[PDB]
C-alpha cells in the first residue's frame, strides 16, 4: 500500500505519497519560515499530517526524516541546527496515541536519503555504500551489509563536521555558500580577468559547472580543489568504515565530471589497493527525492 | 577450558594459555626476525603451535590476532606491513584439516586488543568504545553495542592511517619514533638549553613522561601538542561512529596525565554537548596483553 513520506528541512518541509516502485504522488512543499513564523513548527505535525490522512484513508504508515539529531529509541527529535525548536519529543508515542491504526517511524534525514537510494536508486540493493549529499550542508548516510548504519549511540556518520587538512570542517570548505565564496576569492586573485565567470550576476554550482564545461581554467581549478578536499575526507571515512562504494548527491554533484577526477586521485594517493581495486564512485540519481523516499522506506522495513 | 591465544607481531610473536579469568600461563615470546630469517614465518604455525598442543592436550581452541589485513571470511592473511609474507592463506581450513578436534579463529590484532579489554579489562563489558593503542604504530579496535566492529568489508577502524590537520597520517605524527623525532626537533629549537631532556642518551615515551612529571616546560609542551593531534583525529572518529567511550593503550599511554588534557580540550572545542556530556576517557590497563587475551576471546564467543 501507499505510505506517507515526510522530509523535514531548514528552508522547506516536504510531504509525499510513495508507491512500492518509488513514485511520489501529491508532492506538497511547505515550511519552514512560514511554519516557524505563525502557529509554530509542531502545530503546522500535526495540521498538515492530519490533512493528508483525511485525503488518503488507506494510508497505514508515516515515515519522517529529520534534519538533525534524533534519539536512539527513535521517538524524540533532539536538535536541528536550522530549526531551534523540537527537543526530547516522544513523536512516535504521541502520533501512535492520536492515530493508533497507523504505524509511525522516524530517522535522520541524511540516513533516510541513503535508505532511499538503497531501495529505489540506480544502485538499488547495493549492500555497503556511503551517500554524500553535497549541498549547503554536507549530509551522509551509510548502508552496511544491507542495513542502515546508525552508529554506537544512534547518530553516526555526521561527516559534514569532520576536520579537514585545512583545520576547518568539511561542510565549511565544500558547502554551496563556501564554494561560491571560494570562487569569488579566486576571481579576485585573477587580476588579468582571464576567467569567464566575471560576467554572471549571481554564482551557483550549476553556473560554475557550465563554465567548467566550456573549458574555463579558473572554473576547472575550483572543482579540482573541491574534489581533492572531498577525496581527503573520504580517505578518513574509508579508513574508519572499510567501505569503497560512494554515491554523490546534492547541488554540487551536477559538477561530478569536474571534481571526481581529483577526488579519485586523492583516494588513490592515500589508500592502498585493498580499498581502491574494486572501488566505485557513482552519481546519486534520486537527487532531492531520496530523503522523502527513504522516510517512506522506514515503514517498508 | 584453557584456550591458546596467539598475538602475531612485527618485532615479536606471542603465545599464551588463557584462563576464563584472563590469566596468561606459559607466555612464550619469539619471532619475528628469527622466524623470517631461517625456516620461514609459516613453518615456524606450525612448529611452535604443534609444540603447544602436545604440552596441553585438553586445549580445544586456538585464537590468532594478525598485524594487518585479514579476509572477510576470516580464513586468509592478506598483508602485514612489517612482515612481507602470508598472502591469501586459508589458515582456518588448513589448521582445521591438521587438527579436526580443535576449533580455530582469526582476527586483526588491534581488534583483538579491543575484544581483550571488553572481556578482561577494568571497563569489561562496556558496550560501545574505541581502544586506541598508541605505540610505534597507532592501532584501534571498536566494540559497538557489545559486538566487535569489523567494517563493511571486514577491515574497518584503520585509524592510524587517517589524515590529520597537518596533512600527514595520525601514526606518522604520534607514533613512538615520530614522537622522539619531534622531541629532538623541539630540543634543537631550545637554543637557551632550558630543557632537562638534553642530558639523556636515548629518548623514549617513558623518559619524556618522567621529565614532564618533574615540570619540564619542553616535555609538557610536547605531550600537549601530541594530545591536540590525538584529540583532532578522535573528533573525526566520533563524528563518523557516534561513540564517546575511549580507552588509551600502548607505550605512549604511560604519559596519559600529560596529553589527555589537550586531547579532551580538542574534543570539547570541535564536538557539541550531544557527544561530550557523558564522554569517558580511560586508561587501557591490560597493556601489551590485550591482543593475546582478545585472540583467545574469539574462541570464547
XYZ file of C-alpha atoms in Angstrom:
602
model
C 0.000 0.000 0.000
C 0.729 3.763 -0.230
C 2.955 5.261 2.519
C 3.302 8.940 3.571
C 6.926 10.101 3.481
C 7.927 13.366 5.172
C 11.300 15.098 4.689
C 11.701 17.840 7.336
C 14.115 20.600 6.195
C 15.573 24.002 7.157
C 14.189 26.056 4.215
C 11.310 23.759 3.055
C 9.302 20.794 4.519
C 8.201 18.046 2.081
C 5.223 15.612 2.048
C 4.552 12.855 -0.471
C 2.675 9.617 -1.060
C 5.186 6.926 -2.042
C 4.345 3.881 -4.238
C 6.222 0.488 -3.938
C 8.066 1.401 -7.225
C 9.314 4.735 -5.760
C 6.902 7.195 -7.401
C 5.956 10.314 -5.363
C 2.271 11.336 -5.621
C 0.697 14.625 -4.386
C 4.120 16.197 -3.529
C 3.398 19.142 -1.188
C 6.175 21.628 -0.283
C 5.780 23.991 2.707
C 7.572 25.178 5.786
C 9.771 26.202 7.046
C 9.921 30.024 7.608
C 6.064 30.180 7.232
C 5.727 27.286 9.740
C 8.035 28.839 12.441
C 6.536 32.356 11.864
C 2.908 31.659 12.807
C 1.332 28.742 14.726
C 4.754 27.026 15.154
C 6.597 24.041 13.657
C 4.925 21.192 15.669
C 1.373 22.729 15.267
C 1.911 23.120 11.471
C 2.509 17.719 12.504
C 0.190 17.927 13.002
C -2.129 20.156 10.866
C -0.524 19.159 7.505
C -0.295 15.403 8.511
C -3.997 15.395 9.528
C -4.954 16.946 6.157
C -3.054 14.117 4.332
C -4.602 11.035 6.129
C -8.111 12.598 5.542
C -7.350 12.649 1.747
C -5.869 9.097 1.772
C -7.742 6.880 4.296
C -5.947 3.676 3.097
C -2.510 5.015 4.291
C -1.336 2.857 7.256
C 2.235 4.193 7.642
C 4.066 7.533 8.052
C 7.884 7.784 7.854
C 9.600 11.066 8.822
C 13.203 12.175 8.152
C 14.667 14.824 10.492
C 17.443 17.442 9.756
C 19.500 16.886 12.887
C 19.964 14.588 15.859
C 17.259 12.046 16.791
C 17.072 9.870 19.964
C 18.397 6.243 19.925
C 14.854 4.825 20.585
C 13.718 6.935 17.542
C 10.892 8.653 19.443
C 12.490 12.098 20.100
C 13.826 14.986 17.964
C 16.924 16.236 19.874
C 18.103 19.342 17.881
C 18.057 20.862 14.361
C 20.814 23.491 13.629
C 18.486 25.302 11.126
C 15.248 24.967 13.268
C 15.799 25.856 17.025
C 12.504 24.099 18.101
C 11.667 20.324 18.893
C 13.681 18.953 21.916
C 13.161 15.453 23.582
C 9.718 14.969 21.862
C 8.275 11.364 22.006
C 6.806 11.866 18.477
C 6.315 8.062 17.823
C 4.262 7.712 21.092
C 2.196 10.963 20.561
C 1.322 10.129 16.868
C 0.596 6.453 17.856
C -1.838 7.680 20.588
C -3.520 10.109 18.103
C -3.604 7.587 15.177
C -3.474 4.033 16.768
C -4.410 2.417 13.405
C -1.243 3.907 11.738
C 2.397 2.746 12.267
C 4.908 5.642 12.671
C 8.725 5.661 12.218
C 11.418 8.407 12.440
C 15.084 8.677 11.322
C 17.790 11.251 10.491
C 17.120 12.769 7.007
C 20.669 12.144 5.599
C 20.351 8.465 6.671
C 16.863 8.398 5.034
C 18.441 9.600 1.752
C 20.877 6.597 1.812
C 17.911 4.248 2.512
C 16.045 5.922 -0.412
C 18.969 5.200 -2.771
C 19.162 1.626 -1.391
C 15.501 0.853 -2.209
C 14.810 2.952 -5.324
C 18.047 4.338 -6.845
C 20.135 3.294 -9.885
C 22.318 1.220 -7.484
C 19.371 -0.205 -5.512
C 20.177 -3.075 -3.079
C 23.955 -2.220 -3.166
C 24.779 -3.623 0.298
C 27.630 -1.392 1.535
C 27.995 2.264 0.491
C 28.079 5.904 1.558
C 25.781 8.551 0.085
C 27.366 12.014 0.286
C 24.760 14.749 -0.246
C 26.830 17.813 -1.221
C 24.587 20.858 -0.723
C 24.559 23.946 1.553
C 25.464 21.391 4.242
C 27.219 18.039 3.748
C 24.918 15.172 4.667
C 25.757 11.465 4.668
C 24.060 8.123 5.118
C 25.670 4.682 5.095
C 24.314 1.226 4.254
C 26.427 -1.586 5.722
C 25.752 -5.213 4.673
C 22.215 -4.115 3.631
C 21.428 -2.436 6.989
C 21.294 1.292 7.760
C 24.386 2.295 9.799
C 23.265 4.368 12.785
C 26.448 4.379 14.914
C 27.035 3.367 18.526
C 24.702 5.961 20.057
C 22.287 6.315 17.090
C 23.555 9.453 15.313
C 26.565 8.209 13.350
C 28.072 9.494 10.053
C 27.923 13.283 10.736
C 30.760 13.646 8.171
C 29.992 17.292 7.280
C 31.530 18.281 10.631
C 34.789 16.274 10.208
C 38.047 18.263 10.335
C 39.959 18.681 7.041
C 43.748 19.061 6.313
C 42.978 22.851 6.423
C 41.640 22.594 10.023
C 38.113 23.789 9.063
C 35.106 21.414 8.843
C 34.283 19.577 5.567
C 30.971 21.442 5.015
C 32.657 24.820 5.797
C 35.054 24.002 2.880
C 32.765 22.359 0.251
C 29.241 23.569 1.280
C 27.475 25.566 -1.533
C 27.889 29.042 0.153
C 31.579 28.301 0.914
C 32.165 27.058 -2.697
C 30.652 30.375 -4.006
C 32.798 32.435 -1.528
C 35.968 30.496 -2.579
C 35.123 31.030 -6.321
C 34.799 34.845 -5.653
C 38.204 34.736 -3.818
C 39.874 33.059 -6.858
C 38.185 35.586 -9.242
C 39.627 38.434 -7.065
C 43.122 36.833 -7.439
C 42.509 36.705 -11.250
C 43.919 40.255 -11.798
C 44.278 39.645 -15.601
C 40.455 38.873 -15.712
C 41.168 35.678 -17.788
C 38.082 33.873 -16.345
C 34.575 33.964 -17.933
C 32.700 33.850 -14.546
C 33.243 37.666 -14.024
C 30.146 38.395 -16.259
C 27.483 36.480 -14.175
C 25.268 38.406 -11.653
C 24.976 35.545 -9.080
C 27.258 32.481 -8.769
C 25.800 28.973 -8.236
C 27.186 25.366 -8.540
C 25.287 24.993 -11.899
C 26.842 28.241 -13.342
C 30.417 27.296 -12.150
C 29.848 23.785 -13.698
C 28.506 25.260 -17.017
C 31.636 27.480 -17.352
C 33.916 24.483 -16.498
C 32.172 22.510 -19.341
C 33.224 25.344 -21.736
C 36.872 24.880 -20.630
C 37.368 27.901 -18.290
C 40.738 27.414 -16.453
C 39.510 29.095 -13.186
C 36.170 27.150 -13.030
C 38.015 23.810 -13.671
C 40.656 24.612 -10.962
C 37.888 25.418 -8.388
C 36.195 21.989 -8.939
C 39.640 20.256 -8.915
C 40.388 21.797 -5.448
C 36.847 20.878 -4.155
C 37.495 17.313 -5.442
C 40.811 16.992 -3.531
C 39.084 18.191 -0.284
C 36.143 15.690 -0.670
C 38.622 12.885 -1.525
C 40.771 13.645 1.560
C 37.694 13.335 3.863
C 36.580 10.136 2.035
C 40.095 8.680 2.775
C 39.285 9.107 6.504
C 35.708 7.687 6.179
C 37.013 4.664 4.226
C 39.827 4.011 6.797
C 37.294 4.024 9.637
C 34.329 2.173 7.959
C 36.090 -0.031 5.332
C 33.611 0.700 2.510
C 34.521 1.629 -1.065
C 31.167 2.283 -2.838
C 30.423 6.004 -2.955
C 27.284 7.765 -4.263
C 27.456 11.537 -4.734
C 24.306 13.689 -4.483
C 23.254 17.284 -3.764
C 23.503 20.500 -5.807
C 27.298 20.229 -6.261
C 27.018 16.627 -7.758
C 25.908 18.253 -11.056
C 29.647 19.079 -11.456
C 30.535 15.338 -10.975
C 32.817 15.168 -14.078
C 34.896 18.198 -12.931
C 35.550 17.328 -9.224
C 35.523 13.438 -9.266
C 38.989 13.084 -11.078
C 40.815 14.885 -8.189
C 38.556 13.107 -5.637
C 39.646 9.722 -7.115
C 43.307 10.961 -7.293
C 43.297 11.847 -3.525
C 41.864 8.370 -2.701
C 44.482 6.561 -4.845
C 47.304 8.703 -3.304
C 46.411 7.911 0.349
C 44.717 4.459 0.246
C 46.305 1.058 -0.591
C 44.955 -1.202 -3.412
C 42.948 -3.238 -0.786
C 40.355 -0.384 -0.925
C 40.834 1.102 -4.412
C 40.965 -2.029 -6.690
C 37.162 -2.608 -6.638
C 36.130 0.933 -5.576
C 33.081 2.579 -7.218
C 32.193 6.290 -7.385
C 28.704 6.850 -8.768
C 26.165 9.645 -9.128
C 23.111 9.602 -6.792
C 20.223 9.788 -9.303
C 17.268 10.272 -6.880
C 18.555 13.833 -6.128
C 16.353 15.808 -3.602
C 13.694 12.994 -3.554
C 15.955 10.421 -1.749
C 15.119 11.805 1.746
C 11.328 11.511 1.302
C 11.620 8.085 -0.443
C 13.872 6.831 2.393
C 11.491 8.217 5.058
C 8.646 6.161 3.480
C 11.180 3.274 3.207
C 11.322 3.092 7.055
C 7.686 1.786 7.079
C 8.504 -0.787 4.293
C 11.180 -2.461 6.539
C 38.667 -24.784 29.495
C 42.115 -23.333 28.630
C 42.459 -21.622 25.208
C 45.663 -20.870 23.225
C 45.919 -17.186 22.298
C 48.446 -16.048 19.682
C 49.384 -12.399 19.035
C 51.366 -12.167 15.763
C 53.640 -9.075 15.676
C 56.334 -7.294 13.625
C 59.203 -7.495 16.178
C 57.938 -10.370 18.424
C 55.308 -13.196 18.176
C 53.446 -14.146 21.390
C 51.849 -17.422 22.623
C 49.892 -17.946 25.830
C 47.380 -20.186 27.570
C 44.419 -18.056 28.670
C 42.164 -18.876 31.677
C 38.432 -17.799 31.863
C 39.515 -15.057 34.384
C 42.094 -13.615 31.915
C 45.335 -15.040 33.339
C 48.118 -15.866 30.820
C 50.021 -19.113 31.545
C 53.276 -20.305 29.869
C 53.782 -16.972 27.982
C 56.285 -17.692 25.174
C 57.805 -14.815 23.143
C 59.549 -15.495 19.800
C 59.634 -14.339 16.229
C 59.831 -12.371 14.340
C 63.316 -11.657 12.826
C 64.459 -15.200 13.913
C 61.288 -16.684 12.324
C 61.675 -14.874 8.917
C 65.491 -15.499 8.887
C 65.505 -19.313 8.892
C 62.726 -21.832 8.114
C 60.193 -19.006 7.452
C 57.215 -17.437 9.247
C 54.505 -20.058 8.384
C 56.894 -23.048 9.091
C 57.894 -21.518 12.483
C 52.413 -22.214 12.730
C 53.064 -24.503 12.669
C 56.163 -25.759 14.601
C 55.502 -23.582 17.714
C 51.677 -24.315 17.651
C 52.351 -28.088 17.428
C 54.725 -27.869 20.427
C 51.947 -26.136 22.482
C 49.029 -28.628 21.856
C 51.470 -31.526 22.723
C 52.093 -29.848 26.156
C 48.360 -29.108 26.721
C 46.195 -31.930 25.254
C 42.961 -30.522 26.831
C 43.176 -27.304 24.680
C 40.253 -27.329 22.174
C 40.593 -23.782 20.762
C 43.249 -21.522 19.177
C 42.616 -17.797 18.539
C 45.132 -15.796 16.462
C 45.461 -11.998 16.101
C 47.162 -10.696 12.932
C 49.135 -7.387 12.423
C 47.490 -6.316 9.184
C 44.602 -7.043 6.847
C 42.646 -10.320 7.137
C 39.989 -11.694 4.709
C 36.234 -11.100 5.385
C 35.600 -14.896 5.821
C 38.483 -14.824 8.405
C 40.411 -17.664 6.740
C 43.173 -15.667 4.940
C 46.025 -13.327 5.978
C 46.093 -10.626 3.239
C 49.161 -8.430 4.119
C 51.319 -7.313 7.084
C 53.306 -4.021 6.573
C 56.082 -5.273 8.958
C 56.109 -8.946 7.659
C 56.073 -9.193 3.767
C 54.974 -12.920 3.842
C 51.428 -14.615 4.199
C 49.042 -13.710 1.273
C 45.507 -15.271 0.670
C 46.211 -18.205 3.108
C 43.101 -20.284 4.158
C 44.633 -20.708 7.670
C 41.265 -21.720 9.336
C 40.770 -24.551 6.735
C 44.459 -25.777 6.840
C 44.612 -25.842 10.722
C 41.094 -27.463 10.847
C 42.296 -30.229 8.438
C 45.501 -30.756 10.523
C 43.708 -30.576 13.941
C 39.982 -31.511 13.293
C 39.341 -31.865 17.069
C 40.334 -28.161 17.646
C 38.257 -25.050 16.707
C 40.329 -22.225 15.102
C 39.527 -18.481 14.764
C 41.450 -15.465 13.333
C 41.055 -11.652 13.593
C 43.021 -8.394 13.200
C 45.319 -7.880 16.257
C 44.159 -4.273 17.039
C 40.524 -5.527 17.003
C 41.620 -8.447 19.267
C 43.040 -5.906 21.763
C 39.593 -4.165 21.968
C 37.929 -7.595 22.482
C 40.548 -8.329 25.208
C 39.636 -5.097 27.040
C 35.918 -5.922 26.584
C 36.219 -9.343 28.283
C 39.001 -8.833 30.849
C 39.849 -5.119 31.300
C 38.966 -2.572 34.024
C 35.994 -1.481 31.829
C 34.950 -5.038 30.904
C 31.545 -5.414 29.152
C 31.473 -1.642 28.267
C 29.251 -1.983 25.170
C 30.445 0.834 22.872
C 34.041 2.122 22.879
C 37.267 2.614 20.943
C 40.625 1.290 22.139
C 43.498 3.392 20.770
C 46.825 1.557 21.113
C 49.437 4.337 20.860
C 52.768 2.649 20.077
C 55.255 2.631 17.157
C 52.074 2.345 15.065
C 48.568 3.512 16.017
C 46.209 0.562 16.320
C 42.485 0.668 17.075
C 39.624 -1.680 17.820
C 35.974 -0.785 18.377
C 33.181 -2.507 20.305
C 29.712 -1.388 19.193
C 26.635 -2.444 21.225
C 28.731 -5.343 22.645
C 29.844 -6.614 19.202
C 33.266 -6.238 17.569
C 33.074 -3.622 14.770
C 34.715 -5.044 11.648
C 33.541 -2.548 8.992
C 31.719 -3.078 5.703
C 34.435 -5.194 4.072
C 35.940 -6.683 7.278
C 38.975 -4.451 7.927
C 37.466 -1.333 9.496
C 38.985 1.160 12.001
C 42.486 1.555 10.439
C 42.665 4.957 12.214
C 46.492 5.129 12.303
C 46.396 5.939 8.574
C 43.795 8.769 8.824
C 44.883 12.203 7.558
C 45.482 14.919 10.194
C 45.084 18.772 10.033
C 48.847 18.719 9.138
C 48.204 16.502 6.058
C 50.372 13.612 7.374
C 48.877 10.368 8.774
C 47.981 10.059 12.500
C 50.654 7.396 13.220
C 53.306 9.432 11.301
C 52.539 12.285 13.790
C 52.048 10.459 17.148
C 53.834 7.079 16.575
C 56.714 6.473 19.096
C 59.583 7.094 16.549
C 57.846 10.274 15.277
C 57.246 11.498 18.892
C 61.020 11.005 19.607
C 61.972 12.810 16.318
C 59.582 15.723 17.165
C 61.038 15.953 20.745
C 64.607 16.188 19.227
C 63.326 18.947 16.835
C 61.940 20.979 19.801
C 65.221 20.438 21.768
C 67.149 21.797 18.708
C 64.868 24.914 18.764
C 65.653 25.256 22.529
C 68.799 27.395 21.883
C 68.893 28.570 25.568
C 69.094 24.820 26.628
C 66.302 25.420 29.248
C 65.035 21.791 28.946
C 66.275 18.871 31.129
C 65.938 16.223 28.322
C 69.330 17.321 26.768
C 71.208 15.070 29.322
C 69.608 11.663 28.356
C 71.464 9.288 25.928
C 68.301 7.837 24.261
C 64.782 9.358 24.274
C 61.690 7.186 24.934
C 57.992 7.906 25.844
C 58.761 6.869 29.499
C 61.765 9.312 29.747
C 59.776 12.236 28.139
C 56.883 11.427 30.595
C 59.268 11.253 33.641
C 60.698 14.725 32.780
C 57.135 16.120 32.262
C 56.244 14.804 35.796
C 59.164 16.928 37.150
C 57.631 20.033 35.489
C 59.918 20.485 32.420
C 58.284 23.138 30.128
C 59.522 21.471 26.858
C 58.439 17.896 27.861
C 54.954 19.186 28.932
C 54.544 21.171 25.638
C 55.457 18.049 23.551
C 52.712 15.939 25.266
C 50.239 18.884 24.987
C 50.833 19.018 21.168
C 50.546 15.159 20.878
C 47.260 15.431 22.856
C 45.782 18.048 20.464
C 46.687 15.821 17.432
C 45.088 12.656 19.008
C 42.002 14.702 20.023
C 41.596 16.118 16.481
C 41.576 12.562 14.990
C 39.165 11.363 17.741
C 36.795 14.248 16.701
C 36.650 12.629 13.223
C 36.219 9.045 14.598
C 33.425 10.209 16.942
C 31.619 12.121 14.106
C 31.669 9.009 11.917
C 30.952 6.264 14.560
C 28.962 8.181 17.248
C 30.811 6.665 20.234
C 32.190 8.593 23.210
C 33.966 5.969 25.396
C 37.704 5.984 24.728
C 40.387 3.655 26.155
C 44.025 4.638 25.628
C 46.772 1.984 25.483
C 50.296 1.474 24.115
C 53.701 2.819 25.201
C 52.628 6.488 24.942
C 49.570 5.924 27.314
C 52.039 5.993 30.255
C 52.011 9.801 29.682
C 48.148 9.828 29.981
C 48.061 12.738 32.508
C 50.216 14.993 30.251
C 48.494 14.529 26.825
C 44.811 13.789 27.839
C 44.009 17.468 28.953
C 44.709 18.819 25.402
C 43.049 15.706 23.877
C 39.866 16.479 25.904
C 40.206 20.234 25.033
C 40.299 19.451 21.244
C 37.171 17.235 21.615
C 35.255 19.921 23.575
C 36.311 22.618 21.017
C 35.042 20.711 17.932
C 32.186 18.484 19.227
C 28.741 19.568 20.550
C 27.478 18.567 24.056
C 25.499 15.626 22.475
C 28.858 13.728 22.414
C 30.852 15.328 25.253
C 28.299 15.437 28.165
C 28.646 11.702 29.019
C 32.046 11.117 27.336
C 34.665 8.935 29.091
C 38.437 8.824 28.502
C 40.077 5.957 30.370
C 43.411 4.154 30.521
C 43.633 0.661 28.927
C 45.001 -1.423 31.837
C 45.681 -4.745 30.010
C 48.609 -3.046 28.153
C 50.507 -5.400 25.707
C 48.458 -8.464 26.893
C 45.113 -7.243 25.373
C 45.930 -8.651 21.882
C 46.644 -12.198 23.133
C 43.667 -12.124 25.582
C 41.371 -10.924 22.757
C 42.725 -13.592 20.362
C 41.765 -16.286 22.937
C 38.471 -14.347 23.409
C 37.496 -15.205 19.779
C 37.117 -18.909 20.808
C 35.033 -17.918 23.926
C 32.355 -16.246 21.680
